[PDB]
Amino acid sequence: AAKKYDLFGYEVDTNTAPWIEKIKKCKYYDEAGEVLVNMNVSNCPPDIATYNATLQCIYQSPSKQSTPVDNESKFCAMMDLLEEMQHRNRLKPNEESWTWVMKECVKSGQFRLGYCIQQVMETECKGCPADLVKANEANAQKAKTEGKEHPGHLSQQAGLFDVKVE
Amino acid sequence: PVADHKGRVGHVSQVIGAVVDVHFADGVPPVLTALDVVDKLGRDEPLTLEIVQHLDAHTGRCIAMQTTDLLKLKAKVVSTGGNISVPVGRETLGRIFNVLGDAIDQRGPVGEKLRMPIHAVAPKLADQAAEDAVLTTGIKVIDLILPYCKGGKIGLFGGAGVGKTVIIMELINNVAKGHGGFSVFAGVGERTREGTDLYLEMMQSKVIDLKGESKCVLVYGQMNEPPGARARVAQSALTMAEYFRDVEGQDVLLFIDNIFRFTQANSEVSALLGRIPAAVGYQPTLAEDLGQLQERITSTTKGSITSVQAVYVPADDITDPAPATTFSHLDATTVLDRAVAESGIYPAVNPLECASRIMDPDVISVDHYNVAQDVVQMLTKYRELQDIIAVLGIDELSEEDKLIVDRARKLVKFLSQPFQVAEVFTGMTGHYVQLDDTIDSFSGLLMGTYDQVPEMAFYMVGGINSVLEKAKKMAEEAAELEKMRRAR
Amino acid sequence: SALTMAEYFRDVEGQDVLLFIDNIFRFTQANSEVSALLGRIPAAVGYQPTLAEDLGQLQERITSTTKGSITSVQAVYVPADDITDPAPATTFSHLDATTVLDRAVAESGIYPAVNPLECASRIMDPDVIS
Amino acid sequence: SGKLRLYKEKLEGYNRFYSIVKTIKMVTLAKYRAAQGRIRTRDFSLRYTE
């Protein structure tokens, strides 16, 4: 309805729904980014709803591309996208945005990031979904029961002349 | 009236780089005439040529304002009936133009009612102003120490990091506010990144109000354009200013950024034609090229055009022919230093490094001259006292020296002014200090009337009254602090 | 001609060959002398406009390929000790090791008069050397 | 050009001289500021030595 305007005062397209449907039809979350690029090139700036769908695609997609990439990280992709919709494209992440990130942490098993996200959601949002918190803590107990709280090489002792700098 | 050479057809005889020779069967049009390459050629932009030389009664050598790629020989060329035409009027306010006077802002048609040729003879000796007059910029430093000359040229020395953009915007706002005159900005050899930033900033300060009334025109011959354009953009902007000066009788402000790039562009053009460069390597017509531009900037009986040109010194050599020739046309000098800015003084102007020719009782009021000289003398003494206190100690100064130091520090703090353009960012409301207030405010401080006011009351305030009100707000503010510290 | 002999030994014989040249600057000097009579406008300082390309073609031929290896040592003359002259300055980019002699060092009785602060080597890396 | 090279070297060399000496002034400035205390604390020690 209301007409947003760009930095030079020209009007912009606000109908993001057709493009959101395209994002929901992507099997790999790298394809979702391509849809966003086409949105901007078409003078259609993604809104909060559009970014939320993209985060959902990352969580629900198998991998970034058909072939595996060396250091794929869904959490990094989500956080990088969030920085774009807050620091660069002035907007605000909402609860759904952070919850999707938290869902990735518990799904992936990176319990430590869950602690940080839980702190983020509690500070920024009303609170972190207790179900995700319980799952995140459960993962932490599993690691400690299996004795893998930290990588082994860090635990191993060292000295002034026993450290291989490499 | 119409010139007979309009619609005259010719054929592109020779093409080399940006230089094109056109043959006209009925006769070459007059020099400086503009021609359009009608031939399609499958280009992306139209090709315009400007006759600069006559090789024979039928052949003429021209310089292309755009790239000459895909231009074949025998291509049809049609004369436009005169020199390059630029739109002039109140419809150009708040708009961006190029050398050809085309709106590059993509904000709809200009809808001008008249056009003027780029090349116009300078005002005759009989049109010169009867007497020199001061231009009240509203800035305490400029109006006091280096007053501007109506119809004069001011060299704004300084680069990025000293607030040049804000000073430019403030001058544009003040001149319209006080003198009701408009402004024309001419970016010659401008980085296209910085040109975009200026347009965005001017929209934020509302000197270019897209939904309202703007008080500035823009003309950008950026670096990416061939040298044939960067050597004429300044003249196009000057033509726009001349319209307001004559038809409307205003006191316009013409900013040129830079004037060195104008010299460089006209130097490259001369080299392309094959002319032998003079010393250093500039064109032999360096003096004439600047003269044909600066001389058009003067105060006539109808209006005036005061120009603020940003001067760049190549290799930091003040004796280089380019700056050396430019200085012969500058009436005032405004120097910006990073050191002043880092000390929290805005605008960052070095009062002792600036200069002006109208600093004479014969032009300005005797009281104004006396006050300005006294301030300069006190500042110079303050620098000398700085050396001593940093050598022997502050306590070693005599009673008179201590008073001089205190007064000088107040003057330094009192030379800073809040610009209205910076209200959004800095929050604090700006101030426009009238000249009459400036002389009285500084004259009183020198005598010693305001020897009891705290030093900080002069920092970033406008006028003597602001100094007093800020003192009330400070004295009353501290009153609560005492009742608190006394209690608790 | 000398380079052609070296190339033949490199390729056909498949041997590791040394190639000493003294002085490579004269090659540029000879071309400059004839360039004026060939109707070529002199470039800066007064060298031929084709200084870079003419030297580049010769230098590129002086290299070690998959068939054999050429170890090339070229003496470069710096006119009036002006190391910023176009001819010497265009040669630094075609070399792995640069031994920059200095007259001041020689006048002090130090031989070889090598200025270590101006010399450089590509193999000066921990991976290659110890 | 050598002549330009010579002059540029000379200028910076003199600049390095101005720097090493500007430091000396700061140093001897301190040894004099601190040593200026004697003027206030003198002229009565030798009264009877007169």
Query: How far is the C-alpha of D32 from the C-alpha of A62, rounded, in Å?
Result: 78
Report the distance separating Cα B462 and Cα B347, nearest Å.
Answer: 13
Q: Which DSSP category does B247 fall into? A: I
Q: Do B200 and A9 touch (CB under 8 A)?
A: no
Distance from CA of C39 to the nearest CA of D (A): 26
* Contact between B164 and B342 (Cβ < 8 Å): no
Q: CA-nearest residue of chain C to D1?
A: C82
Tell how far CA B175 is from the center of its chain: 13
| 3-state secondary structure (DSSP) of residue B115 | strand
- What residue in D sits closest to B388 (Cα-Cα)? D29
* Measured distance CA(C97)–CA(B139) in Å, rounded: 61
Which residue blocks in A44-94 are alpha helix, DSSP H?
48-60, 74-83
> Cα torsion for A53, A54, A55, A56, to the nearest 10°?
50
Distances (CA, A) of B82 to B4, B31, B116, B148, B318: 10, 9, 10, 36, 39
Q: How far is CA B86 from CA B7, B34, B219, C20, C60, in A?
A: 19, 12, 11, 67, 55
The C-alpha R_g of chain D, in whole angstroms, comes to: 22
Count of helices and strands (H, E) across chain D: 2, 0
CB-CB contact of B228 with B65 (8 Å): yes
Using CB atoms, list chains with 3+ pairs below 8 Å to chain D. Answer: B, C
- Of A74, A84, A69, A86, which is closest to residue A29 (Cα–Cα)? A74
Residue B147: DSSP 8-state: P
For the question of residue B115 being annotated catalytic, the response is: no
Please say if B61 is a catalytic residue. no
Q: A147 — contact with chain B (CB < 8 Å)?
A: no
Instruction: Give Dmax (Cα) for chain B.
Output: 99
Q: Is B393 left (phi over 0), alpha (psi -120 to 50) or beta?
A: left
Distance CA C4, CA C14 (A): 14
Give the number of other Cβ atoms within 10 Å of residue B466's Cβ: 19
**Shortest Cα–Cα distance, A12 to chain B (Å):** 15
Q: What would the two tokens of residue B401 be?
A: 């020296």
Max CA pair span of chain A:
69
In sequence order, the 6+-apart residues with CB closer than 8 A to the CB of B17 are: B68, B272
Reply yes or no: is the peptide bond before residue C126 cis, omega within 30 of 0. Answer: no
What sign does the dihedral A67-A72-A75-A81 (CA atoms) show?
negative
DSSP state of A84: I
Residue B257, token pair as written in the block: 């950024």
Write down the catalytic residue from B6, B107, B113, B191.
Answer: B191
Of residues B262, B324, B329, the one with CA closest to residue B298: B329
User: Phi, psi at residue C14, to the nearest 5°?
Assistant: 60, 35
Q: Residue B54's closest CA among B25, B87, B27?
A: B27
Q: Return the closest-CA partner of residue A85 out of A94, A95, A76.
A: A94
Closest of B326, B100, B123, B113 to residue B242, by C-alpha:
B123
Q: Give the up-direction half-sphere exposure of residue D29: CA atoms within 13 A in the CB hemisphere.
A: 13
To the query of whether residue B191 is one of the catalytic residues in this protein, the response is yes
Q: Which two tokens stand for residue B308?
A: 């603020």
Distance from CA of B260 to the nearest CA of D (A): 25
Chain A residues 8-67 within an 8 A CB cutoff of chain B: 8-10
Residue type, B322: A
For B153, other C-beta atoms within 10 Å of its C-beta total 25
Binding positions of B for ATP are 159-166, 191
Dist. CA B292–CA B120, nearest whole Å? 9
Angle at CA B480, nearest 5°, toward B475 and B485?
Answer: 115
> CB–CB of B393 and D33 under 8 A?
yes
Q: What's phi and psi for C74, nearest 5 deg?
A: -120, 130
Resolution (A): 3.5
